[PDB]
């Protein structure tokens, strides 16, 4: 067995390679690469042994069963979908949140998680928005950016980290800020915050809240 090799046909467009069939044939050297033509487990018992059936037949059959489905293609699970992102949302961009309790608050974009949800920070000390996930379709990306190119975000801040932990009620149950979350907030904030304060008046901008007023129409104004 040989080691895998990268596709020798660079993608021109989706579904079309750069090279034709005969071009690839030479590239792959196919001229010289020619070729020509349990269910049971036996055990001892205190008969001596028994042939044990690994899987046993059903002990109950429903009166009716549904048939199988016809096969389809291209219907991948969510985990295998390709993640897209608006060209206007680059790391360090200032986003306006439109929904949730934090709606109207201007936050700092950090990165897109593997599920396509965005990672943002308030930072907590400016608008009281922590390291939080948000959906790109529910934010307005402004033209104001900061260079967080030199910021190191922890690698354990993943979708699983931010996923809600179910709380059982039989009265209520209250969400508690884990100590790890607070430590992570200071780790990220301690780097982003000085970069915010370099831009004059930027910190005050992140404390303010976005709103529509008399005569202000979204389609007219640049963000």
């Amino acid at each position: 067995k040989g080691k895998p090799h990268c596709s020798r046909n660079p993608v021109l467009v989706r579904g079309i390679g750069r090279y034709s069939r005969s071009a690839m044939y030479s590239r792959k050297a196919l001229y010289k690469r020619k070729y020509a033509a349990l269910a049971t487990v036996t055990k001892p018992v205190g008969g001596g042994t028994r042939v044990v059936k690994l899987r046993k037949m059903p002990r109950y059959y429903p009166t009716e069963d549904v048939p199988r489905k016809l096969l389809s293609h291209g219907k991948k699970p969510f985990s295998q979908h390709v993640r897209k992102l608006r060209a206007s949302i680059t790391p360090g961009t200032i986003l306006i949140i439109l929904t949730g309790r934090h709606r109207g608050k201007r936050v700092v974009f950090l990165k897109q998680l593997s599920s396509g949800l965005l990672l943002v920070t308030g930072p907590l000390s400016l608008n009281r928005v922590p390291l939080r996930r948000t959906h790109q379709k529910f934010v307005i990306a402004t033209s104001t950016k900061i260079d967080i190119s030199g910021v190191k975000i922890p690698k354990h801040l993943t979708d699983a980290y931010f996923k809600k932990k179910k709380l059982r009620k039989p009265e209520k149950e209250k969400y508690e800020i884990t100590e790890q979350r607070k430590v992570d907030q200071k780790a990220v904030d301690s780097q982003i915050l000085p970069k915010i304060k370099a831009v004059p008046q930027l910190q005050g901008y992140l404390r303010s809240v976005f709103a529509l007023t008399n005569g202000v129409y979204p389609h007219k104004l640049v963000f």
Binding site: K34, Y35, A36, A37
Partner: peptide, 4 residues
């Protein structure tokens, strides 16, 4: 045949 030649292909093989």
């Amino acid at each position: 045949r030649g292909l093989r």
